[PDB]
């Protein structure tokens, strides 16, 4: 699945007077009387998986719309269904945490643009001239995608303290006794000079068949003309993988895990790109 | 010399509202003396982004400076230790940050705030000018009396041999060191755990594998403070036989190195300053 982390808020144009959309409260209040929102020829549904994670599905197949309306019992317990059965439509997955979200979509699952329309059509309260915004903060990438990147700048290599290479790096700096119980992790922030492309080193570390990292964040351009964008990558890709026997609740655990790993980066991104949100 | 890296802004609304003081513009617009009681403060440019900031209460020295009217070139080549302009501090300016280094009798960052204010920096209602420490310089000596060391960042300029050693460990077998500025090893302990052993082992390596280190730490017991430590020292060393211009070169060179680290302690400790 393609995955990313986003800010959410509603605001005047040019991001003036950003305010929280209370996304968890909003969505949780919709569940008791749960119906699709139709948008053009598309039908969109939200269903809870657990406290922080929702299943966001989409279809334009009227016979699937029919089956969902008549399968009221299959509709209410989905936490332990296979994600790839697509009984509720093409799936995307939404992890909610205050003014930030995590979001993962299958090939045909709904988009954050769809999610914006869902929130409008479901009755997001909005002043005149106020609109809902879902702002990308970081994008999840894979190893083959990294190999096609046009430009790579600052690359940050995160090493959990349990990795052997963690003790290697401290030792070469002069550490004689590393008590792993004291440490969470270390980061190697590899900073280019000027706007120089360090994609050869960055690619060499990321494609190492003996990966010496737990996670990697890098600033990159996919193509010429793209904006410098923060990407993240897990050694255990997990969320990149195909669905295959995974259950909706297992994806929601993967996402809470991913958000915990990245939370420090997320809020860093949040405060620079977005600024403050009330509340 | 006592020295540090600071953020500068105009602050109001419980400190929530922070506005740029545009310090380079303001200083370059200045009339070199302010008398504050029986003291006199003096700013003159040295070179580029560094200004000389001095203090005296000898009235006769003040009238001599005023008539002499020392040229930019005269001040650059002056012995820094000579105090023919008063007891010196040094002020490097870039955007909303400063490097600031004072001699034991040089003016302080309150003196500097005094000087900007008495020279007509404009304030709004309930607004104050603030120079906020981001990173205080320290020495290997001082680290020795430190009994708690938290998160710790090892800066490695790309010229050091351990830069390529580290990259190869991670699997990089084709390093064009000219592409690179440096790397940082950010060492993160578990919640509030004390990692002074690994930290001191690195800092006190008789064959240092670093260019600079910054760390969160408390000197004695009961006090987290962001410190930084430079291979060489230079600024931390006393004002001997060096010139104001040489200090300025050091100021600039030190700032250029730490730039990354200052700009992050910025966004963490102060956040956003509207410009």
Residue numbers in the entry:
A (entry chain B): 1 to 279
B (entry chain A): 1 to 30, 34 to 226, 228 to 279
Quote the passages of the study that discuss this structure, keeping the authors' original sentences.
RexA and RexB function as an exclusion system that prevents bacteriophage T4rII mutants from growing on Escherichia coli λ phage lysogens. Recent data established that RexA is a non-specific DNA binding protein that can act independently of RexB to bias the λ bistable switch toward the lytic state, preventing conversion back to lysogeny. The rex genes are situated directly adjacent the cI repressor gene in the λ genome and are transcribed from the same PRM maintenance promoter that drives constitutive expression of the repressor during lysogeny. They produce a 31 kDa soluble protein, RexA, and a 16 kDa protein, RexB. Here, we have shown by X-ray crystallography that the λ RexA protein has a split, two-domain architecture that shares structural homology with RdgC.
The resulting structure, however, was incomplete and was thus used as a search model for molecular replacement to solve crystal form 2, which refined to 2.05-Å resolution with an Rwork/Rfree of 20.6%/25.1%. The final model shows a symmetric dimer that measures 95 Å along the longest axis. Each monomer contains a split globular domain (residues 1–139 and 248–279) comprised of a seven-stranded antiparallel β-sheet flanked by α-helices that is divided by a dimerization domain consisting of a four-stranded antiparallel β-sheet with four α-helices localized on one face (residues 143–234). These domains are connected via two flexible linkers that we term the hinge loop and the swivel loop (235–247). The β-sheets of the dimerization domain pack together to form a continuous eight-stranded anti-parallel platform above which helices α6, α7 and η1 interdigitate. The globular domains are situated below the dimerization domains and have only minimal contact across the 2-fold symmetry axis via the C-terminus of the α8 helix. This helix kinks at residues 261–263 and interacts with strand β11 of its affiliated dimerization domain, anchored by a salt bridge between D215 and R261. A bound sulfate and two cadmium ions from the crystallization solution provide further hydrogen bonding contacts in this region in monomer A. The sandwiching of a cadmium ion between two monomers at the two-fold symmetry axis produced a significant change in packing relative to crystal form 1, which ultimately yielded the high-resolution diffraction. Superposition of RexA and RdgC shows that the orientation of the globular domains in the crystallized RexA dimer occludes the space beneath the dimerization interface, blocking the formation of an analogous pore and preventing DNA from associating in the same manner. Based on this modeling, we predict RexA undergoes a major conformational change that reorients the globular domains to facilitate DNA binding.
